[PDB]
Amino acid sequence: CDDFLDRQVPQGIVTGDQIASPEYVDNLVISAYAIWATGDDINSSFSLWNYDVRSDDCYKGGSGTEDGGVFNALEISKGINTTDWNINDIWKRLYQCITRANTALQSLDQMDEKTYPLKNQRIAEMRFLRGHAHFMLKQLFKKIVIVNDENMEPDAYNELSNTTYTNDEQWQKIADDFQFAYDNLPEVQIEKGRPAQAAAAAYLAKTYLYKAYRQDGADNALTGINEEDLKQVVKYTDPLIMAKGGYGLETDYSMNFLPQYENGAESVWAIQYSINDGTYNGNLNWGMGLTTPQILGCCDFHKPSQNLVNAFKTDSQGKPLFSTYDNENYEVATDNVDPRLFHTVGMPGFPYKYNEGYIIQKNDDWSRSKGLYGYYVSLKENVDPDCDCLKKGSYWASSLNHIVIRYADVLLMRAEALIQLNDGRITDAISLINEVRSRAAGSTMLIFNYKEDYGVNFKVTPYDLKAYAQDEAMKMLKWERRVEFGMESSRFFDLVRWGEAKDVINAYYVTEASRCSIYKNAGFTENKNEYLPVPFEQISASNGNYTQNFGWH
């Protein structure tokens, strides 16, 4: 009677052998783009705002320090544990991205180009995704596992080890993917979710940059700057490639952070959050669920630091105050300010995201903490409350696209590599800086009246195309990056690339302790805190194959 235990089969399911069949293959491709909108969490955004509170840009926020207590530890650099659930989380999650990319490659690789004249184009897409994941995994941890054999069987995974490659050799493997993506992506994607060739380039460069500040030793301190790495950053940022895909700078900065201008000509590659789309409440950007202003009732995380509000001050010559900005807090009526502030930090006495029927105040309705973490709001990931694109599920989320690569990044990175080459192309790097700066200059759309109605005195001026010292050109480069990327989670990562993590962060820790009291007992341990630890649960479960990070053992 064996004709009896075979009668039943799985319901609503593809079993495993069938997934390899090709009719399911564009399903797999799409499923791998999806997770980037559908696999993050309130506490573990794939924008990594959570783990940029370490930077001198932002405070945790919320009720008090007892709320999300493990992110307070990070913010101050004390109490961080190799077992903290939040870190083991971000690990597990970004490797969940990869499963989808490799499942897709395990079938893409087994197709027929004659039958599928888009095989190489969609292999570039999956490898490009897999890159994007390893890159953020490298930023957050340094000593990552490289999972890049799409045909690897489940039990081969037990013997994987994060030491298999060296530091340069891991960056190189993260390059090897974007390089393939560049050599096989179309110059335009009629579906903007897919990266264009220029998108795989910018990343390819960005990867070489972080590879250029070599930490070829045992600890996280710099061991030299590689010029062959930098020559590659100057290569794949050439405007002749970026023209070939239609990319450039927007007329007005604010356009990169408004739902009305998703996918403009500065959005080199972005996650496509969407609503009214069949999903329970939307493929919304649920990762910014904590950083919605307290006026909605929760939760006032991701609050911008005064140190950032001040770094927009300018002299009467329209330049940053490179050595005097933090002495006295930004005073609206006396100081010349950079316009980029009013798109990054919503300040008290001002409208919350241009909607002047929501003016920010110093009260229960705008600080969940009674002023502990301040009275400032991050504007970039949040929107107008009257938007038809903001819903409430568990937290408040929108459909605002999250950009991974802004063309400004391309320009500044290019300027960075040029300056660091000191081959007389410093002037060219300056000229690139002036493209980004002169843009922010005119960006007074939506805020032109501010001069009369609030007394704000805009004044930003580009630098003079003369000679500059390599230490001097870096100084300005760093600053443009500081003002151009406020609250975009790049900031902490930038200092670790530069290797001045300990020096800058501790100096922020003393200046800011008079203004925020959570920063009193804080302190950056050098050669340890440049990178999160490797999760104990993971090292534990590798039965000897994993190695901890320096200074965590």
Partner 1 sequence: QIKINFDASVSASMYQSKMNVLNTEQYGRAMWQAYVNDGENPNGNALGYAYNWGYNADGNPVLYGMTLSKYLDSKNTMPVADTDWFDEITRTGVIQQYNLSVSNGSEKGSSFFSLGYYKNLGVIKDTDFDRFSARMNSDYKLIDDILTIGQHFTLNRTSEVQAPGGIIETALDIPSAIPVYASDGSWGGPVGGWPDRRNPRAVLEYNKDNRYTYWRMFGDAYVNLTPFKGFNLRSTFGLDYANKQARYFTYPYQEGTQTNNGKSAVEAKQEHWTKWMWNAIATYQLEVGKHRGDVMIGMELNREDDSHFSGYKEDFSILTPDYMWPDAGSGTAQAYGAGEGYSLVSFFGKMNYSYADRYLLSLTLRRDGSSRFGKNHRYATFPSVSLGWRITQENFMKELTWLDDLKLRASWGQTGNQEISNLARYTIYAPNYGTTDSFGGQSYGTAYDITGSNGGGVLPSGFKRNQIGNDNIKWETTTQTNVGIDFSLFKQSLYGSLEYYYKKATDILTEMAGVGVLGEGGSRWINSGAMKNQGFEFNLGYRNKTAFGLTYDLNGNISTYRNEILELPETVAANGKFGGNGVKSVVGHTYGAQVGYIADGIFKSQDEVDNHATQEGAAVGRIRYRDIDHNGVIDERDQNWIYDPTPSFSYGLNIYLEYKNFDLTMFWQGVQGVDIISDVKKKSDFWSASNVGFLNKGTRLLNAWSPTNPNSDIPALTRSDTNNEQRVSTYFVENGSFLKLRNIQLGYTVPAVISKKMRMDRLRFYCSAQNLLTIKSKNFTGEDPENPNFSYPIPVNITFGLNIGF
Integer CA distances (angstroms), 306 to 50, 68, 303, 336, 368, in order? 18, 22, 10, 16, 17
Among 78, 119, 235, 528, binds partner 1 (CB under 8 A): 78
Q: Which residues in 313-372 contact partner 1 (CB under 8 A)?
A: 363-365, 368-372
Contact, 412 vs 481, CB < 8 A? yes
509: its two tokens: 């820790």
As a whole number of Å, the end-to-end CA separation of the chain is: 60
Distance CA 142, CA 235 (A): 25
Binding of Mg ion at residue 232 (CB under 5 A)? no
The two structure tokens encoding residue 471: 């230490």
Interface of this chain with partner 1, residues 443 to 482, rule: CB under 8 A: none
Asked if 422 contacts 428 with a C-beta cutoff of 8 angstroms, the reply is no
Task: Check residue 195 for interaction with partner 1 (CB under 8 A).
Answer: no
- Stretch near Mg ion under the rule CB under 5 A, chosen from 125-133, 264-272, 333-341, 485-493: 264-272
Query: CB-wise, 126 or 209, nearer to partner 1?
Result: 126
Which of these ranges, 34-42, 247-255, 343-351, 470-478, lies near partner 1 under the rule CB under 8 A? Answer: 34-42
3-state SS, one letter per residue, for 240-291: HHHHCCCCCCCCCHHHHHCHHHCCCCCEEEEECCECCCCCCCCECCHHHHHC
Q: Does 291 bind partner 1 (CB under 8 A)?
A: no
Least distance to Mg ion from the beta carbon of 273, Å? 4
Residues 214-243 that bind partner 1 (CB under 8 A): none
Under the binding rule (CB under 8 A), the answer on residue 254 touching partner 1 is: no
The yes or no reply on residue 111 touching partner 1 (CB under 8 A) is no
**C-alpha 16 chain-centroid distance:** 35
Residues flagged as binding site for Mg(2+): 53, 55, 262, 273, 399, 401, 519
Could you give the CA distance from residue 108 to residue 26 in angstroms, rounded to a whole number? 9
Which 8-state DSSP code applies to residue 401? Answer: P
Q: Does 31 bind partner 1 (CB under 8 A)?
A: yes
Residue 257 or residue 458: which is nearer to partner 1 going by CB?
Answer: 257
CB 401 → Mg ion: shortest distance, Å?
A: 4
Residue 526 found at the interface with partner 1 (CB under 8 A): no
Helix (H) or strand (E) holding 355: strand 355-359
What distance in Å separates the CA atoms of residue 165 and residue 98, rounded to the nearest whole number?
18
Buried b (16+ CB within 10 A) or exposed e, 51-74: bbbbbbbbbbbbebbebbebbbbb
Q: Does 19 bind partner 1 (CB under 8 A)?
A: yes
Which residues, 259 to 288, sit near partner 1 by CB under 8 A?
259, 262-263, 270, 272-283, 286-287
- Which span sits near partner 1 by CB under 8 A: 257-265, 341-349, 477-485, 503-511? 257-265
Q: Rank residues 149 and 328 by Cβ distance to partner 1 and give the closer one.
A: 149
Task: Enumerate residues 141-170 that contact partner 1 by CB under 8 A.
Answer: 145, 147, 154, 157-158, 160
Peptide bond into 389 cis (omega under 30): no
User: How far is residue 236's CA from residue 117's CA, in Å, rounded to a whole number?
Assistant: 27
Q: How many residues bind partner 1 (CB under 8 A)?
A: 124
Indicate whether 81 belongs to the interface with partner 1 (CB under 8 A): yes
User: How many degrees, rounded to 5, is the angle at CA 514 between CA 512 and CA 517?
Assistant: 85
CB of 227 to partner 1, least distance (A): 34
Identify the sign of the CA torsion 208, 210, 214, 215: negative
Q: Is 72 in the site for partner 1 (CB under 8 A)?
A: yes
| Nearer residue to Mg ion within complex by CB, 189 or 438 | 189
Cβ closest to partner 1, residue 451 vs residue 520: 520
Of 66 and 464, the one with the shorter C-beta distance to partner 1 is 66
Pairing of strands 351-352, 402-406: unpaired
Q: At what angle do helices 85-108 and 69-76 cross, to 10 degrees?
A: 90
C-alpha distance from residue 258 to each of 131, 263, 353, 383, 487 (Å): 28, 10, 9, 7, 15
Q: Does 401 bind Mg ion (CB under 5 A)?
A: yes
Instruction: Say how far residue 258 (Cα) sits from the centre of its chain.
Output: 18
As measured in angstroms, the least distance from the Cβ of 202 to partner 1 is 18
Which of 71, 247, 273, 354 binds Mg ion (CB under 5 A)? It is 273
Judged by CB under 8 A, the residue of 47, 49, 54, 62 near partner 1 is 62
The nearest distance, CB 518 to partner 1, in angstroms, is 8
Residues 6+ away with beta carbon under 8 Å from 150: 102, 103, 105, 106, 109
User: Which span sits near partner 1 by CB under 8 A: 76-84, 306-314, 325-333, 374-382?
Assistant: 76-84
> Which residue from 237, 399, 434, 538 is in contact with Mg ion, where contact means CB under 5 A?
399
Binding of partner 1 by 42 (CB under 8 A): yes
Site residues for Mg ion, window 7-46 (CB under 5 A)? none
Q: CA of 118: how far to CAs of 113, 123, 194, 241, 481, in Å?
A: 7, 9, 13, 22, 38
Nearest CB to partner 1, comparing residues 218 and 541 = 541
Stretch that binds Mg ion, among 167-175, 228-236, 266-274, 328-336 (CB under 5 A): 266-274
| Contact residues: Mg ion, CB under 5 A | 272-274, 399, 401
